[PDB]
Write a protein that binds this DNA or RNA. Structure first.
Ligand SMILES: [Mg+2]
Ligand SMILES: [Mg+2]
Ligand code: NA
Ligand code: NA
Length: 331
DNA sequence: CCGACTGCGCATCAGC
DNA sequence: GCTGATGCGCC
DNA sequence: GTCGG
């Protein structure tokens, strides 16, 4: 379980708003993560915070945030935030960043030029790049969650088509979906083939062929980016006669070397906390884990050649550990 | 006091 | 024309 | 903004 929004939702929301403002307007990504961290640890606190000093005891909450909590608890609001919400420039910039492709920098230019709304964007399509236009075109669709049943139907199509292109491909839908989530933000598909390894051929056709098949059967509808290794785009479940159309969805497809496949699966399955905690634990046992490989340290810190991996279990075993089921990888 | 806070693929810019 | 930087989305 | 060298 988890503490209800009722407990410290006002505080966590306040911290999340300030988090967004720092990243989108101040362009202070570290202060953005500082705030989110503070919001997380408070969202876990199973007690109604009575003072900023009480919250200060938590890892991620320092003096500044303690002061803000005191102001919020005593008044019900934060002056600095109340002033940011009313600022036309800060609000507009903040808003435009909700478009995929528009970050802090682009949002800034648009607002400096008067472009402050989606409507303003439509009248200025020539000023947008390919990514941004897709983000615009699907603004609303991209903010909708993906229920597990739809992800299942999406997986059906992906696994079916990949196998159809070459039955030797190995495909694994990762992300929260693999962790048994009831809903998802997007679909992350990891791909490999026996003919693709670190020391072999780079083959631009392996990822290209699969994307093509999914476009042939009308599953993939748009392309944000696509190289020889990574593909980012859009997909949509086919419409049932008479029933309403499905929302367009974000889908990523990655071609990974077979010898780095399982480290990739584990990584893109998350959770980020589970990854951080698993990396932190991996440190104690004298190992370093990333998206690509697992390497042995030699006391000074000399990481030798990447250890052989043939399954996710192999990784868990290496670090003296039992394989954690994806559904439990929450923390 | 003061540096770390992950680092990379792909698209697009800035400059030679 | 190229190479390197920057912006962006992401555990 | 917070933590830790
Ligand atoms: Mg700034
Ligand atoms: Mg993801
Ligand atoms: Na603290
Ligand atoms: Na954005």
């Amino acid at each position: 379980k988890a503490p209800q929004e009722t407990l410290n939702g006002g505080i966590t929301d306040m911290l999340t708003e300030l988090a967004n403002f720092e990243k989108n307007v101040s362009q202070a990504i570290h202060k953005y993560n500082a705030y989110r961290k503070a919001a997380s640890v408070i969202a876990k606190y199973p007690h109604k915070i009575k003072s900023g000093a009480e919250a200060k005891k938590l890892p991620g909450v320092g003096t500044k945030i303690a002061e803000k909590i005191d102001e919020f608890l005593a008044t019900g609001k934060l002056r600095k935030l109340e002033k940011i919400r009313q600022d036309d420039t800060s609000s507009s910039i903040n808003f435009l960043t909700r478009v995929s492709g528009i970050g802090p920098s682009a949002a800034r230019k648009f607002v400096d030029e008067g472009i402050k709304t989606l409507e303003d964007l439509r009248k200025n399509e020539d000023k947008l790049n390919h990514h941004q236009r897709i983000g615009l075109k699907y603004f609303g669709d991209f903010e909708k969650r993906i229920p597990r049943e739809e992800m299942l139907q999406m997986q059906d199509i992906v696994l079916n088509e990949v196998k159809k292109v070459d039955s030797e491909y190995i495909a694994t839908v990762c992300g929260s979906f693999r962790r048994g989530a009831e809903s998802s933000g997007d679909m992350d598909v990891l791909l490999t083939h026996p003919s693709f390894t670190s020391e072999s051929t780079k083959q631009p056709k392996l990822l290209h062929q699969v994307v093509e098949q999914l476009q042939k059967v009308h599953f993939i509808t748009d392309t944000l980016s696509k190289g020889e290794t990574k593909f980012m785009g859009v997909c949509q479940l086919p419409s049932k006669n008479d029933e309403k159309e499905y929302p367009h969805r974000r889908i990523d497809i990655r071609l990974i070397p077979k010898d780095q496949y399982y480290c990739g699966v584990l990584y893109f399955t998350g959770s980020d906390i589970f990854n951080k905690n698993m990396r932190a634990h991996a440190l104690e046992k004298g190992f370093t884990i990333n998206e690509y490989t697992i390497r042995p340290l030699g006391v000074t810190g000399v990481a030798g050649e990447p250890l052989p991996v043939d399954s996710e279990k192999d990784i868990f075993d290496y670090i003296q550990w039992k394989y954690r089921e994806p559904k439990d990888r929450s923390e």
